[PDB]
Paper text:
We explored this idea using the model virus [name] ([name]), which encodes a vDUB known as [name] that suppresses Ub-dependent antiviral responses and is vital to virus replication as a protease that processes the viral polyprotein. The tightest binding UbV ([name]) was chosen for further study and was found to block both polyprotein cleavage and DUB activity of [name] in vitro. X-ray structures of [name] in isolation and bound to [name] reveal that the inhibitor exists as a dimer that binds two copies of [name]. [name] blocked polyprotein cleavage activity that is essential for [name] replication, and also, DUB activity that usurps cellular Ub-dependent antiviral mechanisms.
After several failed attempts to crystallize the complex, we ultimately succeeded by covalently linking [name] to [name] by modifying the C-terminal glycines of [name] with 3-bromopropylamine as we have done previously to generate stable complexes of vDUBs bound to Ub. As verified below, the modification yielded covalent linkages between the C-termini of the monomers within [name] to the active site cysteines (C783) of bound copies of [name], which enabled crystallization of the complex for structural analysis. The X-ray crystal structure of the [name]-UbV complex clearly revealed two copies of [name] bound to one [name] dimer. The C-terminal tail of each [name] monomer lies within the active site cleft of [name], where the C-terminal propylamine is covalently linked to the sidechain of C783 of [name] as expected, and the interactions between the C-terminal tail of [name] (71LRLRG75) and [name] are consistent with how Ub binds the protease. Furthermore, the sidechains of L71 and L73 of [name] pack against a hydrophobic surface of [name] comprised of V840, I847, F849 and F870. The sidechain of [name] R6 forms a salt-bridge with the sidechain of [name] E759, whose active site binds to another [name] chain. As a result, the total binding interface between [name] [name] and Ub is ~884 Å2 according to PISA, whereas the interface between [name] and [name] dimer is expanded to ~1318 Å2 (~961 Å2 for a [name], which interacts via C-terminal tail, ~356 Å2 for another [name] which interacts via β1-β2 loop). Thus, the dimeric structure of [name] expands the hydrophobic binding interface with [name] compared with Ub, and this likely underlies its high affinity and selectivity for the protease. The X-ray crystal structure of the covalently linked [name]-[name] complex agrees with the SAXS ab initio envelope model of the non-covalent complex, and this suggests that the binding conformation is not disturbed by the introduction of a covalent bond that was needed to crystallize the complex.
Author numbering:
A (entry chain C): 734 to 874
B (entry chain D), C (entry chain B): 1 to 76
D (entry chain A): 730 to 874
The structure:
């Protein structure tokens, strides 16, 4: 994996919920990651930015500040890679954003609602997901 | 006004599988049953995220064992 | 063999309420929609358990807000 | 209620009234362990087994742990005011006791109630049990689906 040799990461590979313990929905934060080593490298915004746009619409937080906050918590190898440039951001980034900004997100997918983000929070947002193809995130329900 | 109430009820799907079936085969069974693409499927048993290239026997998944499905949506 | 898979999908219940409705009244409306006795109902909003003698306005529950339901069953 | 009144002056409890998940942090299902309680201070008083003990019987069948050991385990984690009170004598044990038992023995219980399945107990566990609940009345807990 690229994050095993990521210069901007330090420490062993651990699940996200172990590195940043919150009241996550079960197995939604078990994805492998590493602790950020260097500060933000100020990566350019992903071209496929509809996940950030949907979160920005709901939380009234600018997409630049959302993306900068991700660069403080995740290594660069999990922020700009082959999936990010071709498909866009994932609900794993939503979980990281949810931890950063203390909200729980409800994602109304084509097959039913799902939850991402710590439950020990007050702010609640709604995201709509379509399989497509290609998949798209939109605010609201 | 109008409000929503989120119930605590969970949904289970029954699958008939063989011990030698691979995880990818298990995912394709959930696609035929519920309509979820294998790309956005993440199966967890015993707290460890199961790998696509492994079989149910590799994870010691007996009969009537319960697996947890987690959706990884992208897109835008 | 046969295995069980737990999906992560969430069920919601829609209720027609007024700002002055008591929490007891809210639980009574859930019984009429799902059939859950009010005794075994626990409603949580903004991380705090809602007391029966209070109203939706007391907790500042605006329209389209979501309440979490947890069952407390005894019995054987 | 949301706060058993005898708990506030229970001689077997110390500390403030906090939700169960704050005094015993685990990966509980959301808000299933938010019920208020206090930390047990005194050792077990060896309270008699409740007359309505289907919950202990249901857990005993699934986990092969004698109801006596299950009941003693509860007396180490919960104060007496939440183990033998009015509701215990007339209605029996609750799923909140099941959450405490799940924490003590590291299992997650699926409760097949009359309106759907419901989960109690920490998710960072391996042992899985199935318990059936019937509203009745009277309410009853039974092993299995």
């Amino acid at each position: 994996a690229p994050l095993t040799n990521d210069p901007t990461a330090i420490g062993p590979v651990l699940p996200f919920e172990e590195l940043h313990p919150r009241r996550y929905p079960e197995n939604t934060a078990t994805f492998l990651t590493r602790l950020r080593s260097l500060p933000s490298n100020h990566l350019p915004q992903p071209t496929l930015n509809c996940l950030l746009s949907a979160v920005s619409d709901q939380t009234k937080v600018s997409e630049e500040h959302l993306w900068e906050s991700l660069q403080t918590i995740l290594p660069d190898s999990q922020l700009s890679n082959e999936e990010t440039n071709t498909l866009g951001l994932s609900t794993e980034h939503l979980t990281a954003l949810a931890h950063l900004y203390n909200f729980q997100a409800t994602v109304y997918s084509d097959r039913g609602p799902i939850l991402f983000g710590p439950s020990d929070t007050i702010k609640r947002i709604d995201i709509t997901h379509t399989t497509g193809p290609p998949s798209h995130f939109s605010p609201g329900k | 006004m109008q409000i929503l109430v989120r119930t605590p009820f969970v949904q289970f799907i029954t699958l008939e599988v063989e011990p030698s079936d691979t995880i990818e085969n298990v995912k394709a069974k959930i696609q035929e049953k519920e309509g979820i693409p294998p790309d956005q499927q993440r199966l967890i048993f015993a707290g460890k995220q199961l790998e696509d290239g492994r079989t149910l026997s590799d994870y010691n998944i007996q009969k009537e064992s319960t697996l947890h499905l987690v959706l990884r949506l992208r897109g835008x």
